[PDB]
Amino acid sequence: DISTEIYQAGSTPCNGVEGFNCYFPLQSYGFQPTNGVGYQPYRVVVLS
Amino acid sequence: NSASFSTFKCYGVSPTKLNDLCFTNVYADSFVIRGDEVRQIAPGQTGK
C-alpha cells in the first residue's frame, strides 16, 4: 500500500484536508542510541 | 463518536473494537497539572 490518504478515524468524514478526528496513518520510529532494548529496529528479509 | 473531543490515542486496543473485548474495573480520578505540561506529561517520566 502506497497512499497518503488521511484516515477517517472519526464518525464525521473529512476529505482533502485532515480535519476533526483525522490523522495520518503513518509515523516513523524515534531511533536513538540511548533508546532502550526492544524498540531497536531489526532488518528482516523474507524469501518466497 | 462525539464532537467534543480532539485527541484520542490508545495503545492497548483500538477504540473502535469494544464489543469483542470487555473492559473491567475502569477508574477515573482528577489530578493537578499546570498549563505548561499540555503534552509534556506521559507515563514513565524520570526528569525533574
Short mmCIF file of C-alpha atoms in Angstrom, two decimals:
data_model
loop_
_atom_site.label_atom_id
_atom_site.label_comp_id
_atom_site.label_asym_id
_atom_site.label_seq_id
_atom_site.Cartn_x
_atom_site.Cartn_y
_atom_site.Cartn_z
CA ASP A 1 0.00 0.00 0.00
CA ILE A 2 1.35 3.40 -1.06
CA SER A 3 -1.14 6.20 -0.38
CA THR A 4 -1.07 9.29 1.84
CA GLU A 5 -4.82 9.12 2.43
CA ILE A 6 -5.97 10.66 5.71
CA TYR A 7 -7.72 8.05 7.82
CA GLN A 8 -11.43 8.51 8.58
CA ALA A 9 -10.89 7.76 12.26
CA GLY A 10 -13.88 9.78 13.46
CA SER A 11 -17.54 9.36 12.64
CA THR A 12 -17.68 12.54 10.55
CA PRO A 13 -15.83 12.04 7.24
CA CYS A 14 -13.16 14.51 6.16
CA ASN A 15 -11.84 14.86 2.61
CA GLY A 16 -8.91 16.68 1.04
CA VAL A 17 -7.53 18.17 4.26
CA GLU A 18 -7.39 16.42 7.63
CA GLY A 19 -9.97 17.87 10.00
CA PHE A 20 -11.76 16.62 13.09
CA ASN A 21 -10.61 13.14 14.17
CA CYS A 22 -8.46 12.91 11.03
CA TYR A 23 -4.93 11.56 11.45
CA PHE A 24 -2.09 10.43 9.21
CA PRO A 25 -1.84 6.61 9.42
CA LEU A 26 1.97 6.65 9.08
CA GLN A 27 4.56 7.69 11.65
CA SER A 28 8.21 6.69 11.95
CA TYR A 29 10.42 5.35 14.75
CA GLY A 30 12.32 7.70 17.03
CA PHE A 31 15.61 5.86 16.66
CA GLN A 32 18.24 6.94 19.18
CA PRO A 33 21.43 5.32 20.54
CA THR A 34 20.06 5.87 24.06
CA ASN A 35 16.80 4.11 23.16
CA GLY A 36 16.09 1.02 25.23
CA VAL A 37 16.11 -2.58 24.08
CA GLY A 38 13.13 -3.90 22.12
CA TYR A 39 12.49 -0.59 20.38
CA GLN A 40 15.65 -1.14 18.34
CA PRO A 41 14.90 -1.97 14.68
CA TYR A 42 15.66 -5.35 13.15
CA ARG A 43 16.22 -5.67 9.41
CA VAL A 44 14.13 -8.55 8.08
CA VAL A 45 14.44 -10.28 4.70
CA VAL A 46 11.61 -12.56 3.56
CA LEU A 47 12.10 -15.15 0.81
CA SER A 48 9.23 -16.84 -1.03
CA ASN B 1 -18.33 9.37 18.06
CA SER B 2 -18.76 12.70 19.89
CA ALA B 3 -17.77 16.13 18.53
CA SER B 4 -16.37 17.49 21.82
CA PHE B 5 -13.01 15.65 21.98
CA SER B 6 -10.00 16.21 19.72
CA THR B 7 -7.18 13.84 20.74
CA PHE B 8 -7.77 10.10 21.21
CA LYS B 9 -4.68 7.87 21.42
CA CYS B 10 -4.76 4.24 22.55
CA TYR B 11 -2.11 1.51 22.66
CA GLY B 12 -3.78 -1.41 24.44
CA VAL B 13 -6.54 -1.86 21.86
CA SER B 14 -8.23 0.04 19.05
CA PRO B 15 -11.04 2.21 20.50
CA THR B 16 -13.37 1.15 17.67
CA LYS B 17 -13.32 -2.54 18.65
CA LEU B 18 -15.08 -2.81 22.02
CA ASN B 19 -17.86 -5.40 21.57
CA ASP B 20 -15.43 -8.33 21.48
CA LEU B 21 -13.19 -7.46 24.44
CA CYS B 22 -14.88 -6.03 27.53
CA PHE B 23 -13.23 -3.58 29.92
CA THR B 24 -13.33 -4.31 33.66
CA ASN B 25 -12.59 -2.05 36.64
CA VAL B 26 -12.19 1.27 34.83
CA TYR B 27 -11.38 4.19 37.14
CA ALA B 28 -11.45 7.97 36.70
CA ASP B 29 -9.76 10.41 39.09
CA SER B 30 -8.88 14.10 38.95
CA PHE B 31 -5.24 15.21 39.11
CA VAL B 32 -3.40 18.55 39.20
CA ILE B 33 -1.34 19.53 36.15
CA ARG B 34 -0.21 23.02 35.19
CA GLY B 35 -0.84 24.61 31.80
CA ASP B 36 2.83 24.28 30.84
CA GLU B 37 2.61 20.46 30.62
CA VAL B 38 -0.13 20.20 27.98
CA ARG B 39 1.74 17.44 26.11
CA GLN B 40 4.85 17.02 28.30
CA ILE B 41 3.03 14.57 30.62
CA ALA B 42 3.38 10.86 29.84
CA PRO B 43 3.91 7.62 31.79
CA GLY B 44 7.47 6.76 32.74
CA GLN B 45 8.98 10.17 33.49
CA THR B 46 12.44 10.36 35.07
CA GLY B 47 13.03 14.12 34.94
CA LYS B 48 12.87 16.90 37.50
#
